[PDB]
Amino acid sequence: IKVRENEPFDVALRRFKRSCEKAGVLAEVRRREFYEKPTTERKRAKASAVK
Amino acid sequence: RKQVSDGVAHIHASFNNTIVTITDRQGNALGWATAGGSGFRGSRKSTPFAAQVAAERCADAVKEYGIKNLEVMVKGPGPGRESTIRALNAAGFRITNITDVTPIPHNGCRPPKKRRV
Amino acid sequence: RRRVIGQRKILPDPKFGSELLAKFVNILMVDGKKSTAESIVYSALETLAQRSGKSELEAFEVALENVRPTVEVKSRRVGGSTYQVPVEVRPVRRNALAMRWIVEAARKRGDKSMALRLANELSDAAENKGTAVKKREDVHRMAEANKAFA
RNA sequence: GCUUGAGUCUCGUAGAGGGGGGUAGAAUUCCAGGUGUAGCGGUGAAAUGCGUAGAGAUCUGGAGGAAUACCGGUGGCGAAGGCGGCCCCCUGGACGAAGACUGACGCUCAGGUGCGAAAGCGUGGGGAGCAAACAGGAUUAGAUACCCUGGUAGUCCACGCCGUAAACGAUGUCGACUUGGAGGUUGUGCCCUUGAGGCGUGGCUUCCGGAGCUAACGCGUUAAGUCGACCGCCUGGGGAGUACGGCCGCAAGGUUAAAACUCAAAUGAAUUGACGGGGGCCCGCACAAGCGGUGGAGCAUGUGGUUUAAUUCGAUGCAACG
């Protein structure tokens, strides 16, 4: 993101910054979009959370 | 003839390749290098080691200008995305700014199906 | 397998004493003949000893500890590579690879007696030439030129 | 006649309700210009393709079309189909809250009318991306495919038309009732509201489960429970959702819908095993890691084939073949 280091180091980490982008946002868009498919799989995680 | 101490270090972290290009501050190209000059093919194009190979070639072709500040423009997935950052720094540049210009789908184009296997 | 492998005791050279020199007998064992082996060892040692400085243990030892690899390549689909990935080996297996290659190299000579063959080959190990060395220069060539994780 | 059914009115509630009209930014693309240079692109590898005629990348400017990252969720709304930026205008539905009127005005429905995703068809616009088709390249033995590079129609819009979809909660619609748990959402009354909150009472909505039902799986107060009202349909599979005709359609076909013949099942759910180039896990010289062979050569030895009057007979994937 446009978050940046405040003093010049390689200690400061930029895979922090892959927090808001590439987070369901990229690395799965390169496939054609069908309305059924992302709607269905969500219902798997709420048996998970209660159980 | 350009010399301004600062310039964007653009990096195109291609998921299939890695290009590294150092542009002026005003977006006027100065140097570039890639996996294909490094002497790689395949998905070997896209590794940390290989990214070093290009990041550093590119350094011999832009250092004589006198640039030594970075404005990192990480763009796309593609491993070896921070080898390059680190490489530059570790070779007479300094970090200043980590910026994002990265294409983000709003689905203003239609993505292909690609390989369905 | 359950647990991990044990170690197995091997006796060093009696006349000068170097485990590593005795692991060179092991490498030169064919027919099982350790007897007829203990000849060739000293036979190559002297050649070395005259022509070269250092110790007589470091006519072999050192000279070899620079034409031994530090990477071996196998492969597996773990890391997401279909390719031959470098592997920094334990220092003992470093030896084993080179020792082996050097011995193949003196049955590719017809330079009379596995003494005189293997002898002059090891003298050129410090001189860094001979097709024994060049195997390293093919492994490490692949690995670093076509790095695909590690 | 009566009001509690139903319905209207009133006052609000929230929402991707609809339709038309405006509009934004990102992104992709192209065009223009600059910079910069020998590759780019792709893949499992590659090649076609695209590069010195200066691409890719990078910046700057312009143009356009389509879609709206996040939001965003069994979240919400709609009768269903279905509906995503944002605004305006016109407008629909639901709900809740008080009361108030009307006075069974209702439910459902063969026929009929209306709504109907996508593709498609006509006419005119428009054309970014993707992509039937189509053309190379690749894979394979073949490959009119998966795979890669492109790319036309189309997708988009206006208007009309066709009316189909495992049109799916595979559950007709409406009403009436019957244990409960936990969650979502959305109103409202009340509580030192002395808590970010506590108790009620509704609307819509999911997951789970008792009884019960069912062949089981499960369904389970939004039923497949327990009832009713009316309608729709089914009546072995294959033949065949086809033919023939009628009807509708511009057409494609849709709509209605058989019979002969033919088979003894077809079918559902669940069990066990088996298998899976399924998944998870775990082993064995199974592999890796090594070291030595065989197959090359000759001979021994067995077999097959063939010949011979007989080449005695048996053994045949490992698990027959010194």
Side-chain angles (χ1 to χ4, degrees):
Chain A
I1 26 178
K2 289 274 216 169
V3 186
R4 65 195 73 158
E5 21 62 55
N6 64 125
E7 292 294 320
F9 300 120
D10 291 300
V11 164
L13 302 171
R14 62 303 308 180
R15 291 295 86 92
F16 289 359
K17 313 184 177 63
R18 197 171 78 187
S19 38
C20 282
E21 307 312 308
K22 199 206 174 286
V25 180
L26 308 149
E28 71 294 295
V29 184
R30 196 160 177 206
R31 185 74 179 221
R32 304 181 304 219
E33 302 72 44
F34 285 90
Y35 309 164
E36 187 179 63
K37 315 306 183 306
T39 309
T40 46
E41 318 284 305
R42 315 186 172 195
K43 309 173 162 66
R44 180 166 190 226
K46 196 179 58 182
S48 277
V50 173
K51 195 260 302 88
Chain B
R1 306 165 181 90
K2 288 282 188 163
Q3 175 182 148
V4 284
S5 182
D6 73 44
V8 185
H10 159 273
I11 170 171
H12 183 175
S14 324
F15 201 53
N16 299 100
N17 175 79
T18 300
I19 329 171
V20 182
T21 297
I22 284 166
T23 48
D24 203 66
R25 183 51 52 154
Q26 304 295 307
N28 298 60
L30 306 170
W32 59 276
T34 196
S38 298
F40 293 88
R41 290 290 296 232
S43 289
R44 287 187 281 93
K45 297 180 172 301
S46 307
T47 64
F49 182 82
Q52 296 180 234
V53 196
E56 188 169 37
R57 183 177 180 163
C58 185
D60 310 295
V62 297
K63 79 176 187 171
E64 69 309 301
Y65 283 118
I67 316 282
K68 51 199 84 73
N69 291 294
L70 300 172
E71 175 169 312
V72 169
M73 286 187 192
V74 173
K75 171 200 173 188
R81 304 177 212 63
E82 65 280 79
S83 288
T84 287
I85 298 159
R86 189 263 309 141
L88 295 156
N89 296 327
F93 297 63
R94 213 206 62 186
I95 186 67
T96 312
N97 299 326
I98 289 197
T99 45
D100 186 83
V101 170
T102 292
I104 295 295
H106 294 61
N107 290 89
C109 63
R110 177 46 173 207
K113 53 153 174 63
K114 232 65 178 53
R115 172 175 286 185
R116 287 190 292 147
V117 193
Chain C
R1 292 77 60 116
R2 300 287 181 133
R3 292 190 199 205
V4 277
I5 61 170
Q7 217 290 120
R8 177 195 303 275
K9 43 190 193 185
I10 301 292
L11 280 296
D13 199 283
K15 296 194 164 63
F16 305 90
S18 274
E19 210 42 80
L20 302 161
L21 191 56
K23 187 177 160 169
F24 195 50
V25 181
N26 294 123
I27 287 282
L28 192 42
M29 215 168 280
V30 293
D31 305 311
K33 298 281 166 304
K34 190 156 180 66
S35 48
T36 62
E38 196 67 76
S39 292
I40 307 187
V41 192
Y42 302 133
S43 312
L45 196 58
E46 298 156 276
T47 298
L48 299 178
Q50 176 56 255
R51 296 180 164 178
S52 304
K54 303 151 295 301
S55 304
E56 303 184 66
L57 306 179
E58 304 167 42
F60 177 69
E61 290 174 313
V62 177
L64 194 65
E65 286 174 293
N66 290 100
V67 289
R68 71 171 197 189
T70 187
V71 297
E72 180 193 326
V73 286
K74 300 167 188 192
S75 62
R76 58 207 61 170
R77 310 289 166 265
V78 184
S81 189
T82 61
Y83 300 96
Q84 306 287 314
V85 303
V87 179
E88 191 280 338
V89 302
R90 205 167 163 166
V92 297
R93 181 43 178 292
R94 299 177 61 177
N95 300 297
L97 297 152
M99 282 173 174
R100 165 185 318 144
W101 311 342
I102 292 273
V103 156
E104 188 168 331
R107 312 193 179 195
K108 296 284 179 289
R109 288 170 172 245
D111 299 354
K112 271 63 62 174
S113 176
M114 296 294 182
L116 304 176
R117 298 174 206 199
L118 197 41
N120 305 319
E121 181 63 65
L122 272 160
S123 301
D124 304 336
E127 294 312 272
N128 308 73
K129 52 184 155 68
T131 50
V133 305
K134 74 114 90 177
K135 263 181 199 74
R136 201 155 64 84
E137 308 301 291
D138 288 350
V139 178
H140 290 36
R141 161 181 70 72
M142 177 141 74
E144 305 176 42
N146 303 127
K147 209 171 289 172
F149 316 120

Short mmCIF file of all heavy atoms in Angstrom, two decimals, chain C residues 43-67:
data_model
loop_
_atom_site.label_atom_id
_atom_site.label_comp_id
_atom_site.label_asym_id
_atom_site.label_seq_id
_atom_site.Cartn_x
_atom_site.Cartn_y
_atom_site.Cartn_z
N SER C 43 51.44 -46.10 -2.91
CA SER C 43 51.86 -46.01 -4.31
C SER C 43 51.52 -44.70 -4.90
O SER C 43 52.20 -44.30 -5.88
CB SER C 43 51.46 -47.31 -5.15
OG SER C 43 51.83 -48.52 -4.46
N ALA C 44 50.44 -43.99 -4.43
CA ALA C 44 49.96 -42.76 -5.06
C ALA C 44 50.47 -41.68 -4.12
O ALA C 44 50.93 -40.64 -4.54
CB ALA C 44 48.42 -42.60 -5.05
N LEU C 45 50.46 -41.96 -2.74
CA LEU C 45 51.02 -41.09 -1.77
C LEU C 45 52.33 -40.50 -1.95
O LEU C 45 52.56 -39.38 -1.53
CB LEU C 45 50.99 -41.87 -0.41
CG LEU C 45 51.19 -40.99 0.88
CD1 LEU C 45 50.14 -39.88 1.00
CD2 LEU C 45 51.39 -41.84 2.10
N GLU C 46 53.25 -41.28 -2.52
CA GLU C 46 54.69 -40.91 -2.70
C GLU C 46 54.84 -39.94 -3.86
O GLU C 46 55.53 -38.94 -3.75
CB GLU C 46 55.64 -42.15 -2.97
CG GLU C 46 55.61 -43.13 -1.76
CD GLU C 46 55.99 -44.52 -2.18
OE1 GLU C 46 55.02 -45.21 -2.66
OE2 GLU C 46 57.18 -44.97 -2.07
N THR C 47 54.19 -40.28 -5.00
CA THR C 47 54.05 -39.42 -6.13
C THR C 47 53.66 -38.02 -5.75
O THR C 47 54.20 -37.06 -6.23
CB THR C 47 53.05 -39.85 -7.32
OG1 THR C 47 53.49 -41.08 -7.91
CG2 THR C 47 52.77 -38.85 -8.49
N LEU C 48 52.62 -37.97 -4.88
CA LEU C 48 52.15 -36.82 -4.39
C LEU C 48 53.17 -36.02 -3.54
O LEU C 48 53.46 -34.84 -3.74
CB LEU C 48 50.90 -36.99 -3.49
CG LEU C 48 49.56 -37.60 -4.03
CD1 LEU C 48 48.47 -37.71 -2.89
CD2 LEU C 48 48.90 -36.87 -5.27
N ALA C 49 53.78 -36.78 -2.59
CA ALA C 49 54.67 -36.38 -1.56
C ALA C 49 55.86 -35.68 -2.04
O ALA C 49 56.19 -34.66 -1.49
CB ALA C 49 55.15 -37.59 -0.68
N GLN C 50 56.39 -36.16 -3.25
CA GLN C 50 57.58 -35.52 -3.81
C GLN C 50 57.23 -34.21 -4.43
O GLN C 50 57.81 -33.17 -4.13
CB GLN C 50 58.16 -36.46 -4.85
CG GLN C 50 59.39 -35.92 -5.64
CD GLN C 50 60.49 -35.50 -4.71
OE1 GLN C 50 60.82 -34.33 -4.40
NE2 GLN C 50 61.17 -36.57 -4.12
N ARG C 51 56.24 -34.32 -5.37
CA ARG C 51 55.90 -33.22 -6.21
C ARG C 51 55.22 -32.01 -5.59
O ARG C 51 54.99 -30.98 -6.23
CB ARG C 51 54.91 -33.71 -7.31
CG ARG C 51 55.47 -34.74 -8.28
CD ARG C 51 54.45 -35.24 -9.38
NE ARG C 51 55.22 -35.91 -10.45
CZ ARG C 51 54.67 -36.48 -11.53
NH1 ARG C 51 53.47 -36.11 -11.96
NH2 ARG C 51 55.37 -37.46 -12.25
N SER C 52 54.74 -32.10 -4.34
CA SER C 52 53.82 -31.20 -3.81
C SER C 52 54.31 -30.84 -2.43
O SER C 52 54.95 -31.64 -1.78
CB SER C 52 52.40 -31.78 -3.76
OG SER C 52 52.01 -32.21 -5.01
N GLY C 53 53.98 -29.62 -1.93
CA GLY C 53 54.29 -29.32 -0.53
C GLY C 53 53.17 -29.78 0.39
O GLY C 53 52.59 -30.87 0.13
N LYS C 54 52.96 -29.08 1.54
CA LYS C 54 51.98 -29.31 2.62
C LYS C 54 52.50 -30.61 3.38
O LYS C 54 53.67 -31.03 3.28
CB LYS C 54 50.51 -29.38 2.16
CG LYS C 54 50.15 -28.05 1.40
CD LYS C 54 49.06 -28.09 0.29
CE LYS C 54 49.39 -28.92 -0.94
NZ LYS C 54 50.61 -28.57 -1.75
N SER C 55 51.51 -31.29 4.05
CA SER C 55 51.80 -32.59 4.70
C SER C 55 51.56 -33.54 3.57
O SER C 55 51.15 -33.17 2.48
CB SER C 55 50.77 -33.10 5.80
OG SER C 55 50.61 -32.14 6.82
N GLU C 56 51.76 -34.89 3.93
CA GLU C 56 51.51 -36.01 3.07
C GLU C 56 50.04 -36.46 3.22
O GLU C 56 49.44 -36.97 2.31
CB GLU C 56 52.52 -37.21 3.18
CG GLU C 56 53.99 -36.88 2.95
CD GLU C 56 54.79 -38.22 3.02
OE1 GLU C 56 54.64 -39.12 2.18
OE2 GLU C 56 55.59 -38.42 3.96
N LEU C 57 49.44 -36.10 4.35
CA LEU C 57 48.05 -36.12 4.59
C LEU C 57 47.34 -34.97 3.87
O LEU C 57 46.15 -35.13 3.51
CB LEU C 57 47.82 -35.95 6.06
CG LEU C 57 48.53 -36.91 7.00
CD1 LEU C 57 48.25 -36.66 8.49
CD2 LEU C 57 48.13 -38.40 6.60
N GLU C 58 48.01 -33.82 3.60
CA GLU C 58 47.44 -32.69 2.99
C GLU C 58 47.98 -32.59 1.57
O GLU C 58 47.83 -31.54 1.02
CB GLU C 58 47.77 -31.39 3.74
CG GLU C 58 47.29 -31.55 5.23
CD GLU C 58 47.85 -30.43 6.12
OE1 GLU C 58 47.85 -29.26 5.62
OE2 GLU C 58 48.25 -30.71 7.28
N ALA C 59 48.44 -33.73 0.99
CA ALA C 59 48.66 -33.98 -0.41
C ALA C 59 47.46 -34.56 -0.96
O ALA C 59 47.38 -34.64 -2.13
CB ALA C 59 49.91 -34.91 -0.64
N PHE C 60 46.54 -35.05 -0.10
CA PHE C 60 45.32 -35.67 -0.48
C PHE C 60 44.36 -34.72 0.07
O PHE C 60 43.60 -34.14 -0.71
CB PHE C 60 45.18 -37.07 0.27
CG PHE C 60 43.87 -37.66 -0.09
CD1 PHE C 60 43.62 -38.13 -1.41
CD2 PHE C 60 42.88 -37.95 0.92
CE1 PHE C 60 42.39 -38.73 -1.64
CE2 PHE C 60 41.75 -38.73 0.63
CZ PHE C 60 41.47 -39.07 -0.67
N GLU C 61 44.20 -34.70 1.45
CA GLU C 61 43.19 -34.01 2.22
C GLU C 61 42.80 -32.65 1.71
O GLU C 61 41.73 -32.51 1.10
CB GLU C 61 43.33 -34.03 3.79
CG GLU C 61 43.06 -35.40 4.41
CD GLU C 61 43.36 -35.35 5.92
OE1 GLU C 61 44.46 -34.79 6.31
OE2 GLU C 61 42.57 -35.92 6.70
N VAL C 62 43.71 -31.64 1.82
CA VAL C 62 43.47 -30.26 1.32
C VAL C 62 43.17 -30.27 -0.13
O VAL C 62 42.19 -29.56 -0.51
CB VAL C 62 44.72 -29.40 1.53
CG1 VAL C 62 44.50 -28.01 0.95
CG2 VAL C 62 44.80 -29.21 3.04
N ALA C 63 44.06 -30.87 -0.94
CA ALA C 63 43.94 -30.82 -2.37
C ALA C 63 42.51 -31.20 -2.90
O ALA C 63 41.98 -30.71 -3.87
CB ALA C 63 44.87 -31.82 -3.15
N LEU C 64 41.87 -32.12 -2.16
CA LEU C 64 40.56 -32.69 -2.44
C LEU C 64 39.39 -31.78 -1.87
O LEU C 64 38.32 -31.67 -2.51
CB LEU C 64 40.45 -34.08 -1.84
CG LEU C 64 39.32 -35.01 -2.27
CD1 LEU C 64 39.35 -35.45 -3.71
CD2 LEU C 64 39.08 -36.23 -1.36
N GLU C 65 39.61 -31.12 -0.72
CA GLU C 65 38.72 -30.20 -0.06
C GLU C 65 38.55 -28.87 -0.72
O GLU C 65 38.27 -27.81 -0.15
CB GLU C 65 39.18 -30.04 1.43
CG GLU C 65 38.85 -31.27 2.31
CD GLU C 65 39.52 -30.95 3.65
OE1 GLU C 65 40.80 -30.91 3.69
OE2 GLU C 65 38.81 -30.87 4.65
N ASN C 66 38.62 -28.91 -2.14
CA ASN C 66 38.41 -27.77 -2.97
C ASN C 66 37.90 -28.18 -4.37
O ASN C 66 37.66 -27.30 -5.25
CB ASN C 66 39.74 -26.91 -3.16
CG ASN C 66 40.06 -26.22 -1.89
OD1 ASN C 66 40.93 -26.71 -1.16
ND2 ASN C 66 39.36 -25.09 -1.51
N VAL C 67 37.71 -29.51 -4.58
CA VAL C 67 37.19 -30.03 -5.78
C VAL C 67 36.17 -31.05 -5.39
O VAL C 67 35.69 -31.87 -6.17
CB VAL C 67 38.27 -30.67 -6.64
CG1 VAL C 67 39.18 -29.59 -7.19
CG2 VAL C 67 39.00 -31.70 -5.70
#
